[model samples]
Target: QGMLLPETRNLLDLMDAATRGGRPRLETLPHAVGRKAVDKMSEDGEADPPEVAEVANGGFAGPASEIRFRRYRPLGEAAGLLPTLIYYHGGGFVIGNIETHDSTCRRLANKSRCQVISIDYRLAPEHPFPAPIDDGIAAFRHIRDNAESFGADAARLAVGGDAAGGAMAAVVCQACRDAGETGPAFQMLIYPATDSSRESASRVAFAEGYFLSKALMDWFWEAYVPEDTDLTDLRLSPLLATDFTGLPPAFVLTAGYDPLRDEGRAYADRLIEAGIKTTYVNYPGTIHGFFSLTRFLSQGLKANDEAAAVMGAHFGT
Candidate 1:
């Protein structure tokens, strides 16, 4: 189903208009384009204020790569431990940082009534495929191991993110399951890029006009994966994984007009076929970045609420 209101359409139009006028040409410098665009977008719109009990600025996990994060705790309840969520931000594995996703993380923490820890993993070119994936796994393991110190319940842990971050989250979940290790209680994927090879039908169908383009995705992939890496490796391309039998339950969100839409849907379908409990929803008429743009898109707010509701239900938060 699609967005049920007009404001969603209006926000999509506004974003389209803005991006179209100053769309970054991928050929010039694809690796740096997303960072430039994000800077401009943040400058144009006053950054949204974070809402949660506490926003800590340090990393409890990962190496000394200055890999920072913001931990969001549920408000007004300091007496009891709560469910935990480890989040990763999206910038095609190149641009986003903790600040870019501050507001959304807080919103999820507050709405889901869970402790949210958003990680700032190392980006591409300087650190490719295995690095981000490794950092993601380490961060989740750290949170799962030390949830009580952060006022989180060890039994109820989750991993989630937007776009590339979401894709990484999925990969980490699979890695944990493959290794027979205790990982997240559930997975939240928002318009995730499951296959970096750009072979999906949605990649071709919704490629250019709905905001994110093929050239842009190509640029991001080039920067994030080494030239010699196999495109079908499960960690790099979860869609190519031979099995999806043992990962955590999942909540998958897709944008109807997003180039990565089908891949996200396909992943959810795979999960279901593997006998995993999954909730898959598509926000019609919305574009790829809606999950991080709740301030502008009414549907974004609705989708965020829905995502939290699903997580809360699954994890009993």
Candidate 2:
């Protein structure tokens, strides 16, 4: 009974036609070409981005160089310190930056009436496995330690992202907990890629036609992970982590048609079983990446509103 919504079906048809027109699937294109293609596709048919009180560009120290960030503060908020979310964009680890997810961060900040810091972490192949994770941890530490400068409250800081970015956020939390350090007050993981060791039933079923096909996932995996890297590394596959104790509360979201659906569920279940407060939501009629396609898919907006409401309640905003 898992069926695609009419809106999702139509988009899939159009993608099929595009394929017939010699537009190769992104997985087959060169990395640079694929990056541009994904960016263009992300903005296609998108409505005008929602307005926020303020948007500022800034950066922090990375492992080697400066890592950029874009901060969005909602309207009607007090000038005092605000609850903040450190967000990373989806793209499997190979592509996507803060720019691709600008509208999403704006929507979250506006709806939740909180600050959203969209990180521009280094991508893959050039700086493969562990690099993005390192940046994710570093960004969190920098912002949490210097919360005042970013107009954020260190006590209410959260970490989140979509797809690979979501995975990184989860890893950061686990990494911090394992190190006996403070981590996010909460986690907002949207269709997070929690496991990389093997494919799930959903992965095989939705291997193609969906926006995030299995071939594309393979490309991303290869690009971000070196040949000899362990597939079971907790940093790469958080679901493989045996201990889930003491991690922060969480809101884990997934799409029924997403290849990552089961892994996202597994991660959430682990949290619940460990007695951590967690909320899990799955959009049964949507495809992967629906969270960022608010213009064409109504479900995207619904998910945004739902997540924002939950986050608002959590932050007491």
Which candidate wins on lDDT? 2
Candidate 1 at residue 242, lDDT? 82
Give candidate 1's error at residue 33 in angstroms.
7.6
Clash pairs, candidate 1, are: none
The whole-model lDDT of each prediction reads 0.79, 0.89
RMSD of model 2 against the true structure: 1.2
All candidates: TM-score: 0.90, 0.97
For model 1 the TM-score comes to 0.90
Q: Pairing residues by index, what is the TM-score of model 2?
A: 0.97
Candidate 1 lDDT: 0.79
Residue 105: error of model 2 in Å? 0.7
